[PDB]
Amino acid sequence: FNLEHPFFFTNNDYSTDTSIKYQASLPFNWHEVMNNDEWVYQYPIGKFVERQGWKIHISSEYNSSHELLQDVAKICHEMRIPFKHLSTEDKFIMRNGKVVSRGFSGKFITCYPNQNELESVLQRLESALKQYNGPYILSDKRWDEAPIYLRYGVFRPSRDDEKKVAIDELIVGDEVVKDERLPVFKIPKGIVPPDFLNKWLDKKDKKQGDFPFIIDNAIRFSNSGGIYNARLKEDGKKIILKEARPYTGLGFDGTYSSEKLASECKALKILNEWSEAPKIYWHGKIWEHTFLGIEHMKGVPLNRWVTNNFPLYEVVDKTKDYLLRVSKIVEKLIDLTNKFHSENVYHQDLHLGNILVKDEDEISIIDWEQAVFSNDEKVVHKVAAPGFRAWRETLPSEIDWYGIRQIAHYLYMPLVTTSDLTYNYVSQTRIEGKKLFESLGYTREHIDYVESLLSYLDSKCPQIENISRKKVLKPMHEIRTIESEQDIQDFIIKLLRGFTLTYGQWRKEFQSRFFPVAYYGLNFNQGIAFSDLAILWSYQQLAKKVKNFKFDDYYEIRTQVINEAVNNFKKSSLSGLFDGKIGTIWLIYEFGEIDRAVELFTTHFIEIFENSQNKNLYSGQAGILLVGLYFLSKGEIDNKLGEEILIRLREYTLNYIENPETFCKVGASDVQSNDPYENFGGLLYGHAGVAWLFGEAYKLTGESIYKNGLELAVDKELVAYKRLLPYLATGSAGLLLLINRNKEILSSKYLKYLTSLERATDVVFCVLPGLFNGFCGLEVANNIYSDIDDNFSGQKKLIEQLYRYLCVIEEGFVIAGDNGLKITTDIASGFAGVAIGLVSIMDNKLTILPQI
């Protein structure tokens, strides 16, 4: 949004609140105290407010919000009910929008009266307002005609003489009930209503010309409607409808969803004579909401069409015949786009999910809620997909043409998702896709046809000035081949140079951390997953590979990270290897101050072993055992400290041999955001990290106890031999890494599968650029332990594949972060996420984890 800061991520420190605030006049014997940046509480002084009473939630629209607030304040000041309301316009938009949860909607004014002075204040409020219709909150029933809603909610925290405080537990009797925020008005158990309110709870009204809809499913309850099917009583075709509750759903401008669906109705009413043309089967307003049902055609969205029809592997694409399909569907897109540009109707939102394709490659356009019926203004693109946002308030027809250009460049090369970050990013895809379509062996006529199409779509795009504060980021146009080692050093000095640039950009805007992090790990500041010193460590190792440093800021940062990386042990409580307590000690070990690192390792060793509730390589005792094993191989500690480590490691594997499941839990096979019960493949979050532990343990010591558990761990990882997850951390490339590490140890039956998963991991495309869940983790493991000098071939593979993810800044390059947009540098996806691969591919060390 507008308050969302560019370049890097931001959790919450730019609540700027540059808008008109909400406040009311304060009389004597009253107060206005600031609550948590959203409410202002006003209470009379010396008046005993009680707990556990009947609240009233008053809701209103955007236009009459100030007038209704002034009316409720002026009717509530002369009498003795406490009163609170929202702070500013931006928080009012946030509480009445499309992304906010449906349980908290319309929370504008919550007064807190008493039991005795209740009927009087409700009748006074009803007669006082008597107008200003607004949203219906999904908590209560609408008392009278004014938007007055009585919820038996939560009051002030419990007094010192009272007991059982229990916030949001409502304390009915001795027992307390969880105040669930269900959309249906449900009275909690017990609690006798008052006599004047008992006649309000039973005002049931009769039936009428009831809707002929049979609602079967519900997928997408955002705030007001849903992407959900239904059944029609008369027409046998499937129907999907939208729900428009009045006065809810908003952008930064005062546009409700009712007129958005009205615009969709007035668009698809004249879009009825076309081949796809989802016509309005029924339009009307029932009770107070507005419904709109449209026909659904059979097909798949373009995400599934791209991920099912693209030459990822050499065996999935047989007899080619893919660029002909691309040319056909882009030609259909161009013809149908020029079709509706005559009657002055446009889309203004071109998304992958808005383009539906079916058998014989027939396109279909849906989701016309943001249509426009006039092309003579220069409005800015308000709502857009992550990768399909226009720039500099350009013309709506060419906003649609920009969306068509971006979706065609996605079809040529699927990397649209960072085009909101770097302007004209599609030149990267246009340059890069030709060099691999000439490598797969596609026909020159088809390649020249699709390149001529992409050049034709560039003629209708508004090439304009770049004023969006992201003038730092530009695309490359000097993507050349790699034929010498001098190419490698003058590339890698550019990659070195590009880091202090974004470091200065980050420090000139934030002061909390030192390096930017991805959202998933913005709060994390430890380990070798999301921290502030692992990236600088990779920077130091990769700068050691170049004959000159040319670093402006490298000494005070080095002397500062040691000072700021020692107080986290008394603050943080997350252990393990990645984002753990011992990962920072491991980082300090390859940093300098070896005596300080050994002292920290000898100090914090026993307290971090029993504090792990899991046994994974990410957060578990395996990482502490790995770092202790590495320290035993290095010889930095004594035998008195090193004796019990092997004994505690044997207890980790004797139960593992007898019980191989233990903490394996359910058989999940997805990752997504990598929190909820991961795919447990490979390293890190995977189940195969114990194989890496057993390999590094049998590298140092030797017996038959560790080898059997090693082979059992390889067989336990081997049950997934079947997919679309070849990645390094959570994927199948970790198994290739383990087998390449222990080729002399494992038998020829186990080495027989080495030639099998190589064709599985030889994909020509991955979405993310990182090494955990990106492309670089595959290529760093493809030649990790080849025992041969093909390092230059490995660089000439990896960098030429990595040219598609680069954005140029000064004379340097930098990596787009997770999910494409919102650039960062970490081990997951960043400068370090290629820097570790670069320093590992030409040294065969893989500095993430040692080789004993």
Binding site: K207, D210, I286, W287
Partner: peptide
């Protein structure tokens, strides 16, 4: 019009295909 069925059908939650 004249019905409260809209608020009391607005949560069912089913299917994930």
């Amino acid at each position: 019009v004249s019905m409260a069925e809209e608020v009391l059908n607005l949560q069912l939650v089913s299917v994930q295909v």
